[PDB]
Amino acid sequence: MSKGEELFTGVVPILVELDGDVNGHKFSVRGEGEGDATNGKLTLKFICTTGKLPVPWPTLVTTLVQCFSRYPDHMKRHDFFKSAMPEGYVQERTISFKDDGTYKTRAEVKFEGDTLVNRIELKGIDFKEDGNILGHKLEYNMASRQHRERVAMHYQMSVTLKYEIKKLIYVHLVIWLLLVAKMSVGHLRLLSHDQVAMPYQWEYPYLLSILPSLLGLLSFPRNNISYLVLSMISMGLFSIAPLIYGSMEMFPAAQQLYRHGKAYRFLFGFSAVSIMYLVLVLAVQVHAWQLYYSKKLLDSWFTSTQEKKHKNSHNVYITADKQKNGIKANFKIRHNVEDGSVQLADHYQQNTPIGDGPVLLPDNHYLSTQSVLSKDPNEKRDHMVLLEFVTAAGITH
């Protein structure tokens, strides 16, 4: 891809500096953090260095470095932002808050040494003093949200399936311990062989069935989708497959018992094949429900985490602006108002490269942007802790 993209193969420090004037209220915001374009992830902490921020933090998120977007391998030819580095680009925006004021911003994004810096001037005009902005009626998040009911539905489903799987796992571990004790008793002849027959061959790979069960338990504390899919695959191979093969391996001994009335293996006074078929039948049932619930648990985690992703994402639609040798962007942020509603912020953006030099003019695409806002409990000043995930995605071609 472009040269300039090579500046983003590692974790890059970030500095953000904003000077702002909204309806005469002057303020400054300084931010520092790290940038990881390979994962398209950003972590920054912002501080209002002049005291109290006169506007809500969510209104400043879009203004406070799209060069850290992860561009897919086939879309790297469309990455204008990295292509303009190291000299950088100028980013200008008009942000129209519906039925309220407007932000006018101009920013320079460039490398200063080994640090990607974003220096912004912001001006806000014609804001209503009792509106959603200067009135601070906005929620502290960037959520783009029937859906609330689905979130509760998903959590209850996850809680339900975890409990059912846990109970089946407990039954399985009791069975596993009994078969372990039975196998080691006979192998070392703790009791004679007429008492405890040597195991059938299917019992040896069934010992591996403890691995999917434990990996299932490991996925629960943090809803680890990777652990659970590993649990399901090994379950079919190590919990179900040995029992299917044992159903057939023990069949000739069942034939000899039910037609010749003749047994060669014994388990506590009874024929081993009759005992072990009952064990196999119980274990098959336990593992059949365990897999079924696990697939439903897997479906639930996937749907809920994807549904959350869709609803916490804003799309920045980027088009080429060949007249100014740059790009333009248009998108709308829907800020949540505390009365259970939304305040729209229409974004009009244009980017121009700072220095002379070729840059990538992209075809139409968008950046899928996810931001999570939080607080630092030890930080007393007015601040915002920001975690962001960005990915370009507009082009299937």
Coordinates of C-alpha atoms in Angstrom, one line a residue:
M1 CA 0.0 0.0 0.0
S2 CA 1.0 3.7 0.3
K3 CA 4.1 4.9 2.0
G4 CA 2.8 6.7 5.1
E5 CA 0.9 3.6 6.0
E6 CA 4.2 2.2 7.2
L7 CA 4.1 4.8 10.0
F8 CA 1.1 2.9 11.4
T9 CA 2.2 -0.7 11.6
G10 CA 2.8 -0.3 15.3
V11 CA 1.4 1.4 18.3
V12 CA 1.7 5.2 17.8
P13 CA 1.4 7.8 20.6
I14 CA -1.2 10.5 20.1
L15 CA -1.5 14.1 21.2
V16 CA -4.8 16.0 20.9
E17 CA -5.1 19.8 21.6
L18 CA -8.3 21.8 21.2
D19 CA -9.1 25.5 21.7
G20 CA -12.8 26.3 21.7
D21 CA -15.2 29.2 21.8
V22 CA -18.9 28.3 22.2
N23 CA -21.3 31.4 22.5
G24 CA -18.3 33.2 24.1
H25 CA -17.5 30.4 26.6
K26 CA -13.8 29.7 26.1
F27 CA -12.2 26.4 27.0
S28 CA -9.3 24.1 26.2
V29 CA -9.0 20.3 26.0
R30 CA -5.8 18.3 25.9
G31 CA -5.7 14.6 25.2
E32 CA -3.1 11.9 25.1
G33 CA -3.2 8.2 24.3
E34 CA -2.1 5.4 21.9
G35 CA -3.1 4.4 18.4
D36 CA -3.1 0.9 16.9
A37 CA -4.1 1.0 13.2
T38 CA -3.6 -2.7 12.8
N39 CA -6.5 -3.4 15.1
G40 CA -8.2 0.0 14.3
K41 CA -8.3 0.7 18.0
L42 CA -7.8 4.0 19.9
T43 CA -7.5 4.7 23.6
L44 CA -7.3 8.3 24.8
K45 CA -7.9 10.4 27.9
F46 CA -9.0 14.0 27.5
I47 CA -8.8 16.8 30.1
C48 CA -10.5 20.2 30.1
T49 CA -7.5 22.2 31.2
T50 CA -9.4 25.5 31.7
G51 CA -11.8 24.1 34.3
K52 CA -15.3 23.1 33.5
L53 CA -16.3 22.1 29.9
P54 CA -19.2 24.3 28.8
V55 CA -20.6 21.7 26.5
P56 CA -21.2 17.9 26.9
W57 CA -18.3 15.7 26.1
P58 CA -20.2 13.6 23.5
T59 CA -20.6 16.7 21.3
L60 CA -16.7 16.9 21.1
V61 CA -16.0 13.2 20.3
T62 CA -16.0 13.5 16.5
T63 CA -13.9 16.6 16.7
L64 CA -11.2 15.3 19.1
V65 CA -7.7 11.0 13.9
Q66 CA -9.2 8.8 11.2
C67 CA -5.7 7.8 10.1
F68 CA -6.0 5.0 12.8
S69 CA -8.9 3.3 11.0
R70 CA -8.3 -0.3 10.0
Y71 CA -8.6 -0.5 6.3
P72 CA -9.2 -4.0 4.9
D73 CA -6.5 -5.5 2.8
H74 CA -8.4 -5.0 -0.4
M75 CA -9.3 -1.4 0.6
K76 CA -5.8 -0.1 1.4
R77 CA -5.9 1.7 -2.0
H78 CA -8.6 3.9 -0.6
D79 CA -6.9 5.0 2.6
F80 CA -6.5 8.8 2.1
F81 CA -5.7 9.5 5.8
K82 CA -2.5 7.4 6.1
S83 CA -1.4 8.3 2.5
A84 CA -1.1 12.0 3.5
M85 CA 1.3 11.2 6.3
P86 CA 3.8 12.3 7.6
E87 CA 3.0 15.9 6.5
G88 CA -0.6 15.2 7.3
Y89 CA -3.9 16.8 6.4
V90 CA -6.3 19.6 7.4
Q91 CA -9.7 18.5 8.6
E92 CA -12.5 21.0 8.6
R93 CA -16.1 20.4 9.7
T94 CA -19.5 22.1 10.0
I95 CA -21.6 20.3 12.7
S96 CA -25.2 21.4 12.7
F97 CA -27.1 20.6 15.9
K98 CA -30.7 20.5 14.9
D99 CA -32.8 23.3 16.5
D100 CA -29.6 24.6 18.2
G101 CA -26.2 26.0 17.3
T102 CA -23.4 24.9 15.0
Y103 CA -19.8 23.9 15.5
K104 CA -17.1 25.2 13.1
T105 CA -13.8 23.3 13.4
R106 CA -10.5 23.4 11.6
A107 CA -7.8 20.8 12.6
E108 CA -4.3 19.8 11.5
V109 CA -3.4 16.1 11.8
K110 CA 0.3 15.4 11.3
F111 CA 3.3 13.7 12.7
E112 CA 5.5 15.7 15.1
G113 CA 8.5 13.4 15.8
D114 CA 7.1 10.0 16.6
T115 CA 3.7 11.4 17.8
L116 CA 0.6 11.8 15.7
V117 CA -0.9 15.2 16.9
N118 CA -4.3 16.7 16.2
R119 CA -4.5 20.4 16.9
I120 CA -8.1 21.8 16.6
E121 CA -9.7 25.2 16.8
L122 CA -13.5 25.1 17.4
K123 CA -16.1 27.8 17.4
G124 CA -19.7 27.4 18.4
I125 CA -22.4 30.0 17.4
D126 CA -26.1 30.6 18.0
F127 CA -26.5 28.0 20.7
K128 CA -29.7 28.1 22.8
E129 CA -28.7 28.7 26.5
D130 CA -31.5 26.3 27.6
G131 CA -31.0 23.8 24.7
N132 CA -29.6 20.3 24.9
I133 CA -26.0 21.4 24.5
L134 CA -25.4 24.4 26.9
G135 CA -28.1 22.9 29.1
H136 CA -26.2 19.6 29.4
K137 CA -29.2 17.4 28.7
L138 CA -27.1 14.8 26.8
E139 CA -26.3 11.3 28.0
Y140 CA -22.6 10.4 28.6
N141 CA -22.2 7.8 25.8
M142 CA -22.1 7.5 22.0
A143 CA -24.9 4.9 21.7
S144 CA -26.7 5.0 18.4
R145 CA -29.9 3.5 19.9
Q146 CA -37.5 -2.8 21.1
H147 CA -33.7 -3.0 21.3
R148 CA -33.6 -2.6 25.1
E149 CA -36.0 -5.5 25.4
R150 CA -33.7 -7.6 23.1
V151 CA -30.7 -6.9 25.4
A152 CA -32.6 -8.1 28.4
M153 CA -33.8 -11.1 26.4
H154 CA -30.2 -11.9 25.4
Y155 CA -28.8 -11.7 28.9
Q156 CA -31.6 -13.9 30.4
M157 CA -31.1 -16.4 27.6
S158 CA -27.3 -16.5 28.3
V159 CA -27.9 -16.9 32.0
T160 CA -30.5 -19.7 31.4
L161 CA -28.3 -21.7 29.0
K162 CA -25.2 -21.4 31.3
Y163 CA -27.1 -22.8 34.3
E164 CA -28.5 -25.8 32.3
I165 CA -25.0 -26.5 30.8
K166 CA -23.4 -26.3 34.2
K167 CA -25.8 -28.9 35.6
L168 CA -25.1 -31.2 32.7
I169 CA -21.4 -30.7 33.1
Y170 CA -21.7 -31.6 36.8
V171 CA -23.4 -34.9 35.9
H172 CA -20.7 -35.5 33.2
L173 CA -17.8 -35.0 35.7
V174 CA -19.4 -37.5 38.1
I175 CA -19.6 -40.0 35.3
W176 CA -16.0 -39.2 34.3
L177 CA -14.8 -39.7 37.8
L178 CA -16.5 -43.0 38.1
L179 CA -15.1 -44.2 34.8
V180 CA -11.6 -43.0 35.9
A181 CA -11.9 -44.9 39.1
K182 CA -13.3 -48.0 37.3
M183 CA -10.4 -47.9 34.8
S184 CA -7.6 -47.4 37.3
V185 CA -9.1 -50.0 39.7
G186 CA -9.0 -52.7 36.9
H187 CA -5.7 -51.6 35.3
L188 CA -3.8 -51.8 38.6
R189 CA -6.1 -54.7 39.8
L190 CA -7.1 -52.9 43.0
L191 CA -9.9 -55.4 42.8
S192 CA -9.9 -58.5 40.7
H193 CA -11.0 -58.7 37.1
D194 CA -14.1 -60.8 37.8
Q195 CA -15.3 -57.9 40.0
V196 CA -14.4 -55.0 37.6
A197 CA -13.9 -55.9 34.0
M198 CA -11.3 -54.2 31.9
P199 CA -12.7 -51.3 30.0
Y200 CA -14.1 -51.5 26.5
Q201 CA -12.0 -49.7 23.9
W202 CA -14.4 -46.8 23.6
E203 CA -13.8 -45.8 27.2
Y204 CA -10.2 -44.7 26.5
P205 CA -10.9 -41.8 24.1
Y206 CA -14.0 -40.9 26.1
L207 CA -11.6 -39.8 28.9
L208 CA -10.9 -36.9 26.6
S209 CA -14.5 -35.7 27.0
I210 CA -13.4 -33.8 30.1
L211 CA -11.7 -31.3 27.8
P212 CA -14.8 -29.9 26.1
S213 CA -16.6 -29.8 29.5
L214 CA -13.9 -27.7 31.1
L215 CA -13.5 -25.5 28.1
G216 CA -17.3 -25.0 28.3
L217 CA -17.0 -23.9 32.0
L218 CA -14.1 -21.6 31.0
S219 CA -16.2 -19.7 28.4
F220 CA -18.9 -18.7 31.0
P221 CA -17.2 -16.0 33.2
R222 CA -16.5 -13.7 30.3
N223 CA -18.8 -15.1 27.6
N224 CA -15.7 -16.2 25.6
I225 CA -17.1 -17.2 22.2
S226 CA -13.7 -18.8 21.2
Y227 CA -13.7 -21.1 24.2
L228 CA -17.3 -22.2 23.5
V229 CA -16.8 -23.1 19.8
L230 CA -13.7 -25.1 20.8
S231 CA -15.9 -26.8 23.4
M232 CA -18.5 -27.7 20.8
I233 CA -16.1 -29.2 18.3
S234 CA -14.2 -31.2 20.9
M235 CA -17.5 -32.3 22.3
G236 CA -18.5 -34.0 19.0
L237 CA -15.0 -35.6 18.7
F238 CA -14.3 -36.6 22.3
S239 CA -17.7 -36.8 24.0
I240 CA -20.1 -38.0 21.3
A241 CA -17.9 -39.9 18.9
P242 CA -16.5 -42.4 21.4
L243 CA -20.1 -43.1 22.6
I244 CA -21.3 -43.7 19.0
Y245 CA -18.3 -46.1 18.4
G246 CA -18.9 -47.8 21.7
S247 CA -22.6 -48.4 20.7
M248 CA -21.2 -50.5 17.9
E249 CA -18.1 -52.0 19.6
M250 CA -20.2 -53.5 22.5
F251 CA -22.8 -54.9 20.1
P252 CA -21.3 -58.3 19.5
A253 CA -21.0 -58.8 23.3
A254 CA -24.7 -57.8 23.6
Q255 CA -25.5 -60.3 20.8
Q256 CA -23.8 -63.1 22.7
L257 CA -25.6 -62.1 26.0
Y258 CA -29.1 -61.8 24.6
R259 CA -29.0 -64.9 22.3
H260 CA -26.4 -67.2 23.9
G261 CA -27.0 -66.0 27.5
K262 CA -23.3 -65.8 27.9
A263 CA -21.1 -63.1 29.4
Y264 CA -17.3 -62.7 29.5
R265 CA -17.1 -59.4 31.4
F266 CA -18.6 -58.6 34.8
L267 CA -19.2 -55.5 36.8
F268 CA -20.2 -56.0 40.5
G269 CA -22.1 -59.2 40.0
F270 CA -23.7 -58.1 36.7
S271 CA -22.5 -58.4 33.1
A272 CA -20.4 -55.5 32.1
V273 CA -22.0 -55.0 28.7
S274 CA -25.4 -54.5 30.2
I275 CA -24.1 -51.9 32.7
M276 CA -22.0 -50.0 30.1
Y277 CA -24.8 -49.7 27.6
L278 CA -26.9 -48.0 30.4
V279 CA -23.9 -45.8 31.0
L280 CA -23.5 -45.1 27.3
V281 CA -27.2 -44.3 27.0
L282 CA -27.1 -41.9 30.0
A283 CA -23.9 -40.2 28.7
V284 CA -25.2 -39.9 25.2
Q285 CA -28.3 -38.1 26.5
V286 CA -26.2 -35.8 28.8
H287 CA -23.8 -34.8 25.9
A288 CA -26.6 -34.4 23.4
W289 CA -28.3 -31.8 25.5
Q290 CA -25.0 -30.2 26.4
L291 CA -24.2 -29.7 22.7
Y292 CA -27.7 -28.5 21.9
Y293 CA -27.6 -25.9 24.7
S294 CA -24.1 -24.9 23.7
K295 CA -25.0 -24.2 20.1
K296 CA -28.0 -22.1 21.4
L297 CA -25.6 -20.3 23.8
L298 CA -23.2 -19.7 20.9
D299 CA -26.1 -18.3 18.8
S300 CA -27.1 -16.1 21.6
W301 CA -23.6 -14.6 22.3
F302 CA -23.1 -14.0 18.6
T303 CA -26.4 -12.3 18.0
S304 CA -26.2 -10.1 21.1
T305 CA -22.6 -9.0 20.6
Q306 CA -23.3 -8.3 16.9
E307 CA -26.6 -6.5 17.7
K308 CA -24.7 -4.4 20.3
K309 CA -22.1 -3.6 17.7
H310 CA -24.7 -2.5 15.1
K311 CA -26.4 -0.2 17.6
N312 CA -23.2 1.4 19.0
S313 CA -21.8 2.1 15.5
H314 CA -21.8 5.3 13.4
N315 CA -21.0 5.2 9.7
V316 CA -18.7 8.0 8.3
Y317 CA -19.5 8.0 4.6
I318 CA -16.4 9.1 2.7
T319 CA -16.3 10.3 -1.0
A320 CA -13.5 11.6 -3.1
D321 CA -13.2 15.4 -3.5
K322 CA -11.0 15.7 -6.6
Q323 CA -11.4 19.5 -6.9
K324 CA -9.5 20.0 -3.6
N325 CA -7.4 16.8 -4.0
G326 CA -8.9 15.4 -0.8
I327 CA -12.1 13.8 0.5
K328 CA -15.4 14.8 1.9
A329 CA -17.5 13.2 4.5
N330 CA -21.2 13.4 5.6
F331 CA -22.8 11.7 8.5
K332 CA -25.3 12.3 11.4
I333 CA -24.6 11.6 15.0
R334 CA -27.8 11.1 17.1
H335 CA -26.9 12.1 20.7
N336 CA -29.2 10.6 23.4
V337 CA -31.1 13.2 25.4
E338 CA -31.9 12.5 29.0
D339 CA -35.6 12.6 28.5
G340 CA -35.3 9.4 26.5
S341 CA -34.8 10.9 23.1
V342 CA -32.3 12.1 20.5
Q343 CA -30.4 15.3 19.5
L344 CA -29.2 15.2 15.9
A345 CA -25.8 16.6 14.9
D346 CA -25.3 16.7 11.1
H347 CA -21.6 16.5 10.2
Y348 CA -20.2 18.0 7.0
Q349 CA -16.5 17.3 6.7
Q350 CA -13.7 18.0 4.2
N351 CA -10.0 16.9 4.4
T352 CA -7.1 18.4 2.4
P353 CA -3.5 17.2 2.4
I354 CA -1.1 19.6 4.0
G355 CA 2.0 19.1 1.9
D356 CA 2.6 18.7 -1.8
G357 CA 2.6 15.0 -2.7
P358 CA 0.4 12.3 -4.1
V359 CA -2.4 10.9 -1.9
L360 CA -5.0 8.1 -2.4
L361 CA -8.3 9.5 -3.6
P362 CA -10.8 6.8 -2.6
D363 CA -13.9 5.3 -4.1
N364 CA -17.1 5.6 -2.1
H365 CA -16.9 3.8 1.3
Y366 CA -17.6 4.3 5.0
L367 CA -15.8 3.9 8.3
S368 CA -17.7 1.9 10.9
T369 CA -16.9 3.7 14.2
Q370 CA -17.5 2.5 17.7
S371 CA -16.8 4.6 20.8
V372 CA -17.1 3.8 24.5
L373 CA -17.1 6.6 27.0
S374 CA -16.0 6.1 30.6
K375 CA -14.4 8.0 33.6
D376 CA -11.2 7.8 35.6
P377 CA -12.2 7.6 39.3
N378 CA -8.9 9.1 40.4
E379 CA -9.1 12.1 38.0
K380 CA -10.8 15.0 39.7
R381 CA -10.8 17.5 36.7
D382 CA -13.5 17.5 34.0
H383 CA -12.4 14.7 31.8
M384 CA -13.4 11.9 29.3
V385 CA -11.8 8.5 28.9
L386 CA -12.4 7.3 25.3
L387 CA -12.1 3.8 23.7
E388 CA -12.6 3.6 19.9
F389 CA -12.8 0.9 17.2
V390 CA -12.8 2.0 13.6
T391 CA -13.0 -0.1 10.4
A392 CA -13.5 0.8 6.7
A393 CA -16.1 -1.5 5.1
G394 CA -18.0 0.3 2.3
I395 CA -16.5 -1.7 -0.6
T396 CA -17.3 -5.3 -1.3
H397 CA -15.5 -4.9 -4.7

